[PDB]
């Protein structure tokens, strides 16, 4: 479950922290929020390797572009470079991205689908929890949101995904990009899914495991 929400003086993106292989939870606290540039952040859904790889490649090329032009990078550059790359591979690179960030032109919020289609919105959501997240956004979104309102709406839309979607769970990651300020990245902003104390300690008596051989491994030169 990933979302983007525009407010008066910037944009905020949020994501859940669950990774799933079939019905199994592979990672309970993976980071779906990616830094393309210092003030351009990306929320990724789909194939986890693809969202990281495509986010780092464009992030690398954007950094080199910023050095070449001597200018802070723009979101439309990250958008154009991502969509053209994804289109080239005709959807085979399974990256569904919410791209948002503050640049010299202002605050921007975009979504990118794996086939290379892009959308513009004040509020967006992608992934298996998008329908749960979009229900909250469609219910509570209004024009001229404050920062505090936008964070609350974004985190609430993720929570809707965490509880109601089996593809989402664990914690809520937020990144706030305000105009004229440093982008603040709130890793584990909410932690509403803490494992309760176990009933018993499964610490074994030493010597419990049968051992055939022992040997010292030489890791030195």
């Amino acid at each position: 479950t990933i979302v983007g929400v525009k407010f008066n003086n910037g944009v905020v993106i949020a994501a859940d922290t669950r990774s799933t292989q079939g019905p199994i939870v592979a990672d309970k606290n993976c980071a779906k929020l990616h830094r393309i540039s210092p003030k351009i952040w990306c929320a990724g859904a789909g194939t986890a390797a693809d969202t990281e790889a495509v986010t780092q490649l464009i992030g690398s090329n954007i950094e080199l572009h910023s050095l070449y032009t001597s200018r802070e990078p723009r979101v439309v550059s990250a958008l154009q470079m991502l969509k053209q790359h994804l289109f080239k591979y005709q959807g085979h690179i399974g990256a569904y991205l919410i791209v948002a960030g503050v640049d010299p032109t202002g605050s921007h919020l975009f979504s990118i689908h794996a086939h290379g289609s892009t959308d513009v919105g004040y509020y967006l959501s992608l992934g298996s929890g998008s329908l749960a997240a979009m229900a909250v956004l469609e219910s509570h979104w209004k024009q001229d949101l404050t920062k505090e309102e936008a964070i609350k709406l974004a985190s609430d839309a993720i929570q809707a995904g965490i509880w109601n979607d089996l593809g989402s769970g664990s914690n809520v990651d937020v990144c706030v990009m305000e105009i004229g300020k440093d982008a603040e990245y709130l890793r584990n902003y909410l932690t509403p899914n803490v494992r309760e104390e176990k009933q018993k300690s499964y610490k074994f008596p030493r010597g419990t495991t049968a051992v055939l051989k022992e040997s010292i491994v030489n890791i030195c030169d």
């Binding site: 070449y68 032009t69 723009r74 439309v76 550059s77 470079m81 010299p104 032109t105």
Partner: protein, 241 residues
Amino acid sequence: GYDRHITIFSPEGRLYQVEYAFKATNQTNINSLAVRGKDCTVVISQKKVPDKLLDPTTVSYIFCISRTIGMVVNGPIPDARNAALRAKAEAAEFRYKYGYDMPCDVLAKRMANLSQIYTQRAYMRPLGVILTFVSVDEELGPSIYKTDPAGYYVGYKATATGPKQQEITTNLENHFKKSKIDHINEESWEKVVEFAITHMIDALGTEFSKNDLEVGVATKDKFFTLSAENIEERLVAIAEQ
């Protein structure tokens, strides 16, 4: 002495083919001038039509690169047009790849990096042209960036190019010592063109008719050239003061 025929170092660490490319720059015997207003960047160039059979409307050394970027060339028209077509291609490709209009200074750098390759690779000759790029950049504001056959480029408060470059340069240098500022403190581009022409007349010591000049103006979100009638109106204003 084959070290004077291709772009390899001479014993005293010089590239003669680059130095000779600079001399080709003045082959047209035309002088260009560029200045910055508050809201605009003006570029003026001498227009000489010696042949009576020439269609004067087709004789130009000012090119529209992008819709915001203007380029005046000092050098032979073949190399000028070679540089123009490439700049146009580069500005279009930039907009497609990165989703925003190529800045004046970034195009300048790109054309300067191309020029640098001709000074290092032997099979390519340098272009015998100096490119003056003008725009009102959305980040940096009124901008002048100039490229040469060595692959050198820099920004300018104002600049001049051609045979009588030094005379125009010192004329502008003296004005900016007096005004104490980095631009022409003027609201309308019309009066910035009037300044440019006035200071060229004072520097070269020649008068100008409507057909003796060629004018390019950069405003926010467009660069355009003036017609003979646009210049004529501008010359009348100077005369009546």
